[PDB]
């Protein structure tokens, strides 16, 4: 069903749809070819379904993390930006969306996690893990604790697990090797086992997950936490005074975040191909285009160099952007979903004695490379 002549876009219901509609109106203008927005609840699944079928949209939004999935099937369409489309939009972004070598999105926003504080309670962060199971007893002098994050997920650990030498696949080149992971090197051991101390110190609490970390640093009980651009319209709410800035280094060497991109890819069985990289590179891609969306919802950090130095006056976006220049683009290939599960495990178990960190961390990646 190749529609033909017309743009149609989906776009998931948290973002900013209205405001990418009215740029889908501006094309219709210089055009006459309508656009179309839609947000269909788990779109993300019912992607590949309608698509294997030369079905759905023309061009799907969704986190780059998803596309090799996608691009192994064939689904999405293989784009050409010239050198010049290219030069305007931060580099590392483009790795996000490259699959077996060939680029199969454009990168929109740029997502990571970043260190939030309490203005009030530490007037001025941490510049180092090191130092804060200090800045804990410091703090829980008068009733409060130093740090509380999510420990339940990899994703929120990893920071400090990659700071040293950690990594989930090596990225020699624009292929990922499958074979070369590091979970259980030098660094990573590093990392997790300084995490752990802070559970052993009682400097942290072992079941703490997402919801009870936010709880507490909007309460105003705890004095830093470890979210993203999703968590900050919450602690707007809570009341709370906070600032947002790069993570702690760990061994004099940076946190490693794991960094989301927002990417956009055509249909492979698009028939529109031509117009959907005309309303991209030329409508959307462009600082009215960003601002028109964002407008209507932020879109955190951009791709679009020009529109993230203005955006960037905002001190809780450049550092999200600071963190993922520093972070670790989310590998693309199937074989993350045994990283994760994986390195889920292997941290928990650390963290309850139900396994040594060198125990742990072989068994993940005997698991991971298998
Ligand atoms: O119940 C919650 C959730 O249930 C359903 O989701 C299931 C999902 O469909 C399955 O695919 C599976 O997911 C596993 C996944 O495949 C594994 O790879 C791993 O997940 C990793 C992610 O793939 C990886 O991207 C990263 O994730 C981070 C995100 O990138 C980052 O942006 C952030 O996420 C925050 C969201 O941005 C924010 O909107 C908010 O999320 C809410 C969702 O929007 C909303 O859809 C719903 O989620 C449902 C979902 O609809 C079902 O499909 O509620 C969410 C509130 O929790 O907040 C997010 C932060 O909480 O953060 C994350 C890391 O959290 O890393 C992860 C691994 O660390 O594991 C997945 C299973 O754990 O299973 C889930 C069901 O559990």
Redo the contacts with the bound molecule.
Sequence with gaps: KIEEGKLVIWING?KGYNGLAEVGKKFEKDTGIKVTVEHPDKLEEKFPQVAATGDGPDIIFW?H?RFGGYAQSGLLAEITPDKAFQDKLYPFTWDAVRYNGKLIAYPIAV?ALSLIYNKDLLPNPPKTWEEIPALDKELKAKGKSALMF?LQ????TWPLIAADGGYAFKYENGKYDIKDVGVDNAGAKAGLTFLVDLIKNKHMNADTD?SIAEAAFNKGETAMTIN?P?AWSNIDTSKVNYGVTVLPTFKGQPSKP?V?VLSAGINAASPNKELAKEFLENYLLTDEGLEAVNKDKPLGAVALKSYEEELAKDPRIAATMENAQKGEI?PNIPQ??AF?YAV?TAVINAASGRQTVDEALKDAQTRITK
Excluded: C
């Design positions: 948290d986190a993390d997502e999510n997920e990899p994703y929120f997402y993203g999703w794991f989301g989310m993350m979903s994760w889920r």
